[PDB]
Design a protein around this ligand. Structure first.
Ligand SMILES: OC[C@H]1O[C@H](O[C@H]2[C@@H](O)[C@H](O)[C@@H](CO)O[C@@H]2O)[C@@H](O)[C@@H](O)[C@@H]1O
Ligand SMILES: OC[C@H]1O[C@H](O[C@H]2[C@@H](O)[C@H](O)[C@@H](CO)O[C@@H]2O)[C@@H](O)[C@@H](O)[C@@H]1O
Ligand SMILES: [Ca+2]
Ligand SMILES: [Ca+2]
Ligand SMILES: [Ca+2]
Ligand SMILES: [Ca+2]
Ligand SMILES: [Ca+2]
Ligand SMILES: [Ca+2]
Ligand SMILES: [Ca+2]
Ligand SMILES: [Ca+2]
Ligand SMILES: [Ca+2]
Lengths: 154, 153, 154
């Protein structure tokens, strides 16, 4: 029974690592995870194109809320982090009025525009922000703020 | 046959432990004792908010119950280049009677600055740590960065 | 077959940790890794000596580009991170004109000095910066900017 205890201690090591890893994910990086996706808040004030490049560098894109569950998760994430606004992956940069997600997939029936939005304010708003409530608002791409990236587990 | 398989697994866990240790120390710049982990949160908050934030992370505001802990926190504060942070000490329930965040009572060990605690203007029921490592009572509604503490259960 | 499943599940745990660890390295910390080394950008404006101390506290040193591959990696890292300049581990602090790496190992034939560099401008330039292009330039040690640390895998 020499290997028995070596392996018991091994189990302990793996348990330990799992716990510390979970800690790093939750307490430090404050990440958010679904069954199929990971969501990450980056607390660096940037402009839209810079943000999309930063998300891409991390091997992801700006977050795309295509359904209620995602959007609600993002809203909760924003809530706990205690922020008013972040960039997300929606824009009508190519064709004004025609909004699309960061991956170029077209806009659909689901949305979360705040009342009166999108309003293309001063004909200079082609990017999209999410606010505390979870609602969307179009804003100027040259605006600078924090952002959220989205990752596929593939 | 099973021995070398186990050895190779040992190698894998060694590897993972090392990379994880790297992530903890070099990247996240956290601080670790044999039994505890300490984390600086650089978000300006009021005391109760800070404590809630620590709790949400499954911890509490840092409790320096001995010299080693306190000195560690002081060094951490030094490296981060900060003047003050909230820590887990208060006399919110009974004025003059200080306690740690986990409600465990105050002891002989302390690191009060000269003249502290002074309950300035009868509105100071929370505690800050400063660069030197000394303590000071301050108003709970004050807003600043804070330090959380985590047990390795 | 009770032990079989416990072992299978532990295996799953180790695979899982491997993936999540890789994620934390790449997506969160945005580090760059070679077979033998890890490179880390620190986004805190500091002076050379402070930067070196910070790297040391992390158990490393300021980055040392001793060959073309390293230097090019550092350059790409800088580029994507969207930075103009960072400190690196090169200086002639001890003996003017005689440049050395942070680990005190002497300068060699390989270099990436910009045109006209190093020029010891106003006899007050004893530290080295890397710029977007990947080129080197000597600068005053009292200058404040971001820096890059380098780590051995042992
Ligand atoms: O900075 C002013 C204001 O800008 C944001 O909203 C702008 C625009 O996108 C809205 O459609 C209209 C409607 O009120 O107002 C602004 O032009 C908001 O995010 C707001 O919080 C911000 O203060
Ligand atoms: O703007 C040119 C250059 O300025 C700074 O470099 C200084 C010095 O170190 C250089 O040797 C000389 C070359 O003429 O110029 C300056 O005095 C750096 O900030 C550099 O990035 C910049 O391109
Ligand atoms: Ca427009
Ligand atoms: Ca528009
Ligand atoms: Ca708008
Ligand atoms: Ca009081
Ligand atoms: Ca008091
Ligand atoms: Ca006081
Ligand atoms: Ca000189
Ligand atoms: Ca010089
Ligand atoms: Ca120069």
């Amino acid at each position: 029974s020499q290997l028995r205890k070596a392996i018991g201690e091994m189990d302990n090591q793996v348990s330990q690592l799992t716990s510390e890893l979970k800690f790093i994910k939750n307490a430090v990086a404050g990440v958010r995870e679904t069954e199929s996706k990971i969501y990450l808040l980056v607390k660096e004030e940037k402009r839209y194109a810079d943000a999309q490049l930063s998300c891409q560098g991390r091997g992801g894109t700006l977050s795309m809320p295509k359904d209620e569950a995602a959007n609600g998760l993002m809203a909760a994430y924003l809530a706990q982090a205690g922020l008013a606004r972040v960039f997300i992956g929606i824009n009508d940069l190519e064709k004004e009025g025609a909004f699309v997600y960061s991956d170029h997939s077209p806009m659909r029936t689901f949305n979360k525009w705040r009342s009166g939005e999108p309003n293309n304010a001063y004909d200079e708003e082609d990017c999209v922000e999410m606010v505390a409530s979870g609602g969307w608002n179009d804003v100027a791409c040259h605006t600078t703020m924090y952002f959220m990236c989205e990752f596929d587990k593939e």
